[PDB]
Design a protein around this ligand. Structure first.
Ligand code: FRA
Lengths: 217, 217
């Protein structure tokens, strides 16, 4: 299986503490060493060290001695990564990786758990419609989109018609505004003939604030 | 510090063509035990890395034979014979011979395909958004190639500057094209002091800079 269950995204202010977990499937836990590699925004991977899942011995990379601590939960086939006295520099995605002794390979990488360190607060987004041409309702395929802006932190999920729409749909990378809030757009290419007959509603979600809106275009 | 240096940071290549990525380390990766722990990983879009080749030339389980690696000491090479769309992602080498394992900066494989002009659409701010104090004008460049595309905003016919941000999707895994979105933001106040709002797009796939604009304002 090699299946790894990572814990959810974390938002915290400087000086606090986080503890990320990673549950390894059964019959996988003691067949690998659990490694932690950091990947800061737009930066390369950095090995933080690893923990022995058989003896429980943690080995820390020198660039990670002090605030980081690896621990285990044997009965739960779970490994923990803790960072105390958090700072902006810790903002990154932390990967839980299973590695094999003899080949020294990072065999299986987990989904990664993001950690955002900011003294800002969560802000739900507003969903404005991107009307499919205000005077052009005919012409093969039309406009059609959804603008979700001024939220924090990332990410937001956007699907069209509850997952019904997957064709032409193009959700864009968030962009950080001068306000410190995020903004992004999700557009869908559809046939001008569908306008009128077919209903179009983009469903947005911002779990960091429990926001879950839908907007008819 | 042990640095891994991947020469081509960006590697455009035509479907079916061969691609070659080089990784050069500051220290020999040959271990005192005769082993050379140089691995190659692929990190596809919106995904965690997967191991491809281990210990220089060994294909990992599930890895097509189009992938192969070579090299010794401090010079290594990974080769993708007959590139496919499935190959899109970032390729990075990893050394595990010395102290803390380290990784290379990465190489983004891009699929070369015939030039394709974008379809440009423009969306005026929403009422709900307006009635809240700010105006967001969105200009969309759908399905184009190559990536390089310029978008200039003109209001009252004046080249706007500093009040727009853009985001471009990852190379589509079906047509190999990109998609861009540009947002010009003003205050309901400033949005009123003018009438014509246009976005002048200029792409290689266009004989002359195309522009789209909306009436009111
Ligand atoms: C059953 C089994 O495979 N166990 C096992 C798997 C991996 C590791 N393991 C790791 O997960 C770490 C990564 C990074 C470095 C590592 N080896 C290392 O540091 O060796 C020096 C030493 O001999 O202590 C290889 C892969 C180190 C390691 O030994 C240990 C036992």
């Amino acid at each position: 299986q090699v299946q790894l269950l990572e814990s959810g995204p974390e938002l915290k202010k400087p000086g606090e503490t986080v503890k990320i977990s990673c549950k390894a499937s059964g019959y996988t836990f003691t067949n690998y060493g659990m490694n932690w590699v950091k990947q800061a925004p737009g930066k390369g991977l950095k090995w933080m060290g690893w923990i022995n899942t058989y003896t429980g011995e943690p080995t820390y990379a020198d660039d990670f001695k002090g605030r980081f601590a690896f621990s285990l939960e044997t009965s739960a086939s779970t490994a923990y990564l803790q960072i105390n006295n958090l700072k902006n520099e810790d903002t990154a995605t932390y990967f839980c990786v299973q590695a094999e002794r003899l080949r020294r390979t990072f065999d299986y990488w987990g989904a990664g758990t993001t950690v955002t360190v900011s003294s800002a607060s969560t802000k739900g987004p507003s969903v404005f419609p991107l009307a499919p041409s205000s005077k052009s309702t005919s012409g093969g395929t039309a406009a059609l989109g959804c603008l979700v802006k001024d939220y924090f932190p990332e990410p937001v999920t956007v699907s069209w018609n509850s997952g019904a729409l997957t064709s032409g749909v193009h959700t864009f990378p968030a962009v950080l505004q001068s306000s410190g809030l995020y903004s992004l757009s999700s557009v869908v290419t559809v046939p001008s003939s569908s306008l009128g007959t077919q209903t179009y509603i983009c469903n947005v979600n911002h779990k960091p604030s429990n926001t879950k809106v839908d907007k008819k275009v | 510090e042990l640095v891994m240096t991947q020469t081509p940071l960006s590697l455009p290549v035509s479907l079916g063509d061969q691609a070659s990525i080089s990784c050069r380390s500051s220290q020999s990766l040959l271990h005192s035990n005769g082993n050379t722990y140089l691995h190659w990983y692929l990190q596809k879009p919106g995904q965690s890395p997967k191991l491809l080749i281990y210990k220089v030339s060994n294909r990992f389980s599930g890895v097509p034979d189009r992938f192969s690696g070579s090299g010794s000491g401090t010079d290594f090479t990974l080769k993708i014979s007959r590139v496919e769309a499935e190959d899109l992602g970032v390729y990075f080498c990893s050394q595990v011979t010395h102290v803390p394992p380290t990784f290379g900066g990465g190489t983004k494989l891009e699929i070369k395909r015939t030039v394709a002009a974008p379809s440009v659409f423009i969306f005026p701010p929403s009422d709900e958004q307006l009635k809240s104090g700010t105006a967001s004008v969105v200009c969309l460049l759908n399905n184009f190639y190559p990536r390089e595309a310029k978008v200039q905003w003109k209001v009252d016919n004046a080249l706007q500057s500093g009040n727009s941000q853009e985001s471009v999707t990852e190379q589509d895994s079906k047509d190999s094209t990109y998609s861009l979105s540009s947002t010009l933001t003003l205050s309901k106040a400033d949005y009123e002091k003018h009438k014509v709002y246009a976005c002048e797009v200029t792409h290689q796939g266009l004989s002359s800079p195309v522009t789209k604009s909306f009436n009111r304002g």
